[PDB]
């Protein structure tokens, strides 16, 4: 590592373009950027010295000239209008920045950007105002508490990452290869290893909850020689998470449990929070089932401490020959398409993760415009030629149809859905339907769906333009609808089931693998008055896919090794018009619209035949080279 020889040349030109009166106390790399500390604020020299050094710079005051938290926290409630209504105020010393939250962020941000600098001087801390979210999230609060109490660790973490990213100047890769450790010709445990002769980055690291009883099918291949080498030698530069779902980020905290990695995890803020929530959710579902969890809160916590967030469009160097950029995937809040600029730029890779290419209630179609692009890795969940989804609006009509029939017949509607994803989407469908007077019976929300929902309201900028304004700007907010009733605990859950009142029940998780939805299913499945509606992809080996297949008698190993058979009499429906996955038509259209036209396309994340079908179809229609690799396949990209 010749990092300090690089830092030496920087400290030379910086101490040549910076006011020597401006007592520079330090210059070092912290995360994906150069930071210059100075005890003397003050502009437009950053814009320069930055484009001169060809690096991302950030000037700040020495952490010493910063008024303590418990102190400057009262000086602020003094220097800002009481009408500004400051709901919360947090600190993040790892960046010397004060996060100020208020219902009326205008009177706190300075009626002329003034009060912003007004308080900035009185405490030296970097102010950042945030409009109070309409719903408070335990997850968000928890992450905030961790970031201000772990300041010591993170500041050290950011120095290590920085010295690592710039272990050498911009390098042109000699070779590039991608290895599927999981998620090739199957849905589950997505894990792809990007390799160059200088770097190693992991894109996604999921688990296959549908196959939890089989460690050989549930986890990415830890037995891959190249991967054991990368971990054991400490060569993994980074991990990039496309989105919050467990089959894309679920094994991430396992890596910390066993101290196999302590580098950076790059992802969008919404993803960092949703991920943390689904991971906590996961290990709790396991314990509530009497199983030993894959990891513990202490590991999920380590994940948070090792995560560096980027918003879409932010280009960042994550190693000597790899620059990252995230783009909207339109799958779920915060979902991204990973774009890796590698070496010379003549062999760039775009990794789709899961994506949607038409608008939905919460999101806009995936980005299809990139700078330079040679290889496109895309999902195939609906890759079969006949995998056309039901039109958005016909699905809505079908849903309403079914709810009416069931609610009349004196029954209940069970809609299994993941905490994040279809839950929110379906909620919007029922909410807009409520506003015209269609919701008579109550709508219960079980399985952390409400907490996830809270996270959405805190990231309006990651929602579609339509819903963005409708949220933060207006006082009215769709999720806040009085039609949704969060299930408080196991007693109420049981009350709900025993009660004779018809109702709509939306509960995690989406494939009946675990969580409240399995309880509802089991106790409601016998009565033919009830209805269960699948609105998401049912993976192979899930109870959900069994029910969906029509199997009317399902065995379930219960407590004390005794198996129990649930008799299925309730109505089984499938409405795929709410899917977060691009359907066959969308996938093919995506390839058509993507620009620049990729020289190669690799199909993944889909049942075997679907991956091949899509790959064959893309080649036949667009004449582009394609391939549906197997796990453990490695493709050299030249
Ligand atoms: Zn997903
Ligand atoms: Zn997925
Ligand atoms: Zn080429
Ligand atoms: Zn209640």
Is 248 annotated as ligand-binding? yes
Q: Which residues pair with 239 in a beta bridge?
A: 202, 265
CA distance 337 to 327: 5
What order do you get walking across the sheet with 24-29 strand by strand? 24-29, 34-38, 57-60
CA of 185 to the centre of ligand 1 (A): 16
CA distance 623 to 617: 9
Kindly identify the ligand whose nearest atom is closest to the C-alpha of 503: 4
Q: Which of 326, 327, 348 has its CA nearest to residue 599?
A: 348
Structure tokens at 200: 């190693």
Evaluate whether 118 touches 100 at the Cβ level (below 8 Å): no
CA of 435 to the centre of ligand 4 (A): 22
Tell me the Ramachandran region of residue 106: left when phi exceeds 0, alpha when psi lies from -120 to 50, beta otherwise.
alpha
Kindly identify the ligand whose nearest atom is closest to the C-alpha of 606: 2
CA of 188 to the centre of ligand 2 (A): 7
**Which domains occur in the chain, in start order?**
1-61+137-166 (3.30.300.230), 62-132 (3.30.300.20), 175-390+583-638 (3.60.15.10), 391-578 (3.40.50.10890)
CA of 343 to the centre of ligand 3 (A): 13
- For 224, 288, 294, 417, the CA distances from 285, given in Å and listed in that order, are 29, 5, 11, 15
Tell me the Ramachandran region of residue 93: left when phi exceeds 0, alpha when psi lies from -120 to 50, beta otherwise.
alpha
Assess whether the previous peptide bond of 22 is cis (omega < 30° from 0): no
Structure tokens at 456: 């959405």
CA distance 34 to 58: 6
CA of 605 to the centre of ligand 2 (A): 7
Helix/strand/coil (H, E, C) string of 252-321?
Answer: CCHHHHCCCCCCCEEECHHHHHHHHHHHHHHHHHHHHCCCCCCCCHHHHHHHHHCEEECCCCCCEEEECC
CA distance 329 to 266: 16
CA distance 629 to 637: 14
Evaluate whether 210 touches 540 at the Cβ level (below 8 Å): yes
Write the DSSP symbol of residue 473: I
CA distance 417 to 504: 13
Write the DSSP symbol of residue 595: B
Structure tokens at 403: 């709810």
Evaluate whether 139 touches 146 at the Cβ level (below 8 Å): no
Please, what is the end-to-end C-alpha distance for the chain in angstroms?
27
Write the DSSP symbol of residue 82: G
Evaluate whether 566 touches 556 at the Cβ level (below 8 Å): yes
Neighbours of ion ligand 2 (CB under 5 A): 247, 354
Sign of the four-CA dihedral 359, 362, 364, 370: negative
Burial code of 212-242, b = ≥16 C-beta within 10 A, e = fewer?
A: beeeeebbbbbebebbeebbeeeebbbbbbb
Write the DSSP symbol of residue 369: B
CA distance 384 to 456: 32
Burial code of 71-84, b = ≥16 C-beta within 10 A, e = fewer?
A: ebbeebeeebeeeb
Bridge-based pairing of strands 412-416 and 531-534 is parallel
Kindly identify the ligand whose nearest atom is closest to the C-alpha of 597: 3
CA distance 613 to 73: 60
- Solving technique for this entry? X-ray
CA distance 106 to 80: 11
* Local structure of 236: helix, strand or coil: coil
CA of 582 to the centre of ligand 1 (A): 11
Structure tokens at 166: 């710039």
**Which residue blocks in 319-474 are alpha helix, DSSP H?**
392-408, 422-434, 449-457, 465-468
Evaluate whether 359 touches 331 at the Cβ level (below 8 Å): no
Evaluate whether 632 touches 227 at the Cβ level (below 8 Å): no
Is 404 annotated as ligand-binding? no
Assess whether the previous peptide bond of 596 is cis (omega < 30° from 0): yes
CA of 249 to the centre of ligand 1 (A): 10
CA 112 to chain centre: 35
Evaluate whether 313 touches 325 at the Cβ level (below 8 Å): yes
Kindly identify the ligand whose nearest atom is closest to the C-alpha of 510: 1
Place of tokens 């196959």: 211
CA 505 to chain centre: 25
CA distance 361 to 578: 9
Structure tokens at 344: 């010379």
CA distance 269 to 243: 10
CA of 135 to the centre of ligand 1 (A): 24
CA distance 604 to 586: 16
At a CB cut-off of 8 Å and minimum separation 6, what does 318 contact? 32, 165, 201, 237, 238, 240, 264, 266, 324
CA of 608 to the centre of ligand 2 (A): 15
Cβ-defined contacts of 616-622 (< 8 Å, 24+): 617/385, 617/588, 618/588, 618/591, 621/588, 622/591, 622/592
CA 450 to chain centre: 17
Helix/strand/coil (H, E, C) string of 112-138?
Answer: CCHHHHHHHHHHCCEEEEEECCCCCCH
Q: Which of 325, 269, 177 has its CA nearest to residue 635?
A: 177
Cβ count near 597 (within 10 Å): 13
Neighbours of ion ligand 1 (CB under 5 A): 245, 354
CA of 486 to the centre of ligand 4 (A): 6
At a CB cut-off of 8 Å and minimum separation 6, what does 36 contact? 14, 18, 24, 26, 27, 57, 58, 59, 60
Give this entry's resolution in angstroms: 2.6
């Amino acid at each position: 590592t010749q990092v300090d020889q690089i830092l030496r040349d920087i400290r030379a030109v910086v101490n040549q373009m910076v006011p020597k009166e401006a007592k520079i106390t330090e210059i070092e790399f912290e995360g994906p950027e150069l930071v210059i500390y100075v005890k003397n604020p003050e502009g437009e020299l950053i814009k320069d010295l930055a484009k001169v050094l060809k690096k991302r710079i950030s000037v700040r005051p020495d952490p010493e000239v910063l008024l303590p938290p418990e102190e400057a926290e009262k000086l602020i409630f003094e220097i800002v209008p009481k009408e500004a209504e400051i709901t919360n105020i947090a600190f993040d010393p790892s960046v010397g920045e004060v996060l100020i939250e208020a219902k009326k962020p205008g009177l706190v941000i300075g009626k002329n950007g003034e009060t912003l600098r007004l308080i900035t001087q009185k405490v030296k801390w970097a102010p950042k105002v945030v409009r109070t979210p309409p719903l408070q999230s335990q997850t968000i609060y928890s992450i905030r508490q961790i970031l201000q109490t772990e300041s010591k660790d993170r500041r050290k973490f950011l120095r290590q990452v920085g010295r690592n990213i710039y272990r050498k100047p911009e390098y042109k890769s000699r070779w590039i290869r991608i290895t599927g450790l999981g998620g090739f010709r199957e849905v589950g445990r997505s894990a792809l290893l990007v390799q160059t002769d200088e770097s190693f980055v992991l894109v996604d690291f999921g688990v296959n909850v549908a196959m939890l009883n089989d460690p050989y099918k549930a986890f990415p291949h830890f037995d891959a020689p190249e991967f054991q080498y990368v971990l054991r030698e400490g060569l993994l530069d980074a991990i990039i998470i496309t989105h919050a779902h467990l089959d894309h980020c679920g094994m991430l905290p396992y890596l910390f449990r066993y101290n196999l990695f302590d580098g950076p995890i790059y992802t969008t803020p919404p993803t960092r929070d949703l991920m943390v929530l689904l991971q906590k959710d996961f290990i709790e579902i396991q314990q509530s089932n009497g199983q030993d969890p894959l990891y513990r809160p202490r590991d999920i916590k380590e994940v948070i401490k090792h995560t560096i967030t980027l918003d879409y469009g932010e280009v960042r160097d994550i190693s000597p020959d790899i620059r990252l950029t995230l783009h909207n995937a339109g799958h779920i809040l915060g979902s991204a398409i990973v774009h890796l600029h590698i070496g010379n730029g003549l062999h760039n890779i775009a990794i789709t993760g899961d994506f949607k290419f038409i608008p939905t209630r919460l999101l806009e179609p995936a980005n299809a415009k990139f700078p330079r692009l040679e290889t496109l890795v895309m999902e195939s969940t609906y890759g079969g030629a006949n995998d056309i989804q039901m039109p958005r609006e016909e699905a809505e009509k079908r849903l309403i149809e079914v709810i009416h029939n069931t609610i009349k017949r004196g029954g209940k509607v069970l809609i299994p859905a993941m905490a994040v994803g279809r839950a929110q989407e379906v909620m919007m469908v029922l909410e807009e339907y409520a506003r015209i007077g269609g919701i008579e019976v109550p709508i219960y929300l079980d399985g952390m769906i409400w907490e996830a929902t809270a996270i959405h309201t805190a990231y309006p900028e990651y929602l579609s333009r339509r819903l963005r304004e409708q949220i933060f700007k207006e006082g009215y907010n769709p999720f806040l609808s009085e039609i949704f009733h969060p299930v408080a605990n196991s007693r109420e859950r049981q009350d709900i089931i025993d009660s004779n009142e018809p109702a709509i029940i939306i509960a995690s998780s989406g494939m009946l693998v675990g969580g409240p939805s399995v309880e509802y299913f089991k106790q409601l499945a016998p009565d033919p008055k009830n209805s269960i509606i699948f609105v998401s992809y049912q993976a192979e080996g899930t109870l959900g896919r069994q029910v969906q297949s029509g199997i009317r008698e399902i065995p379930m190993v219960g407590e004390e090794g005794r198996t129990e058979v649930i008799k299925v009499n309730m109505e089984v429906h499938t409405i795929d018009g709410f899917s977060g996955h691009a359907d066959r038509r969308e996938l093919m259209n995506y390839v058509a619209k993507v620009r620049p036209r990729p020289e190669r396309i690799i199909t993944v994340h889909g049942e075997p035949q679907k991956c091949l079908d899509l790959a064959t179809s893309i080649h036949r229609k667009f004449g582009i080279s394609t391939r549906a690799p197997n796990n453990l396949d490695t493709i050299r990209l030249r």
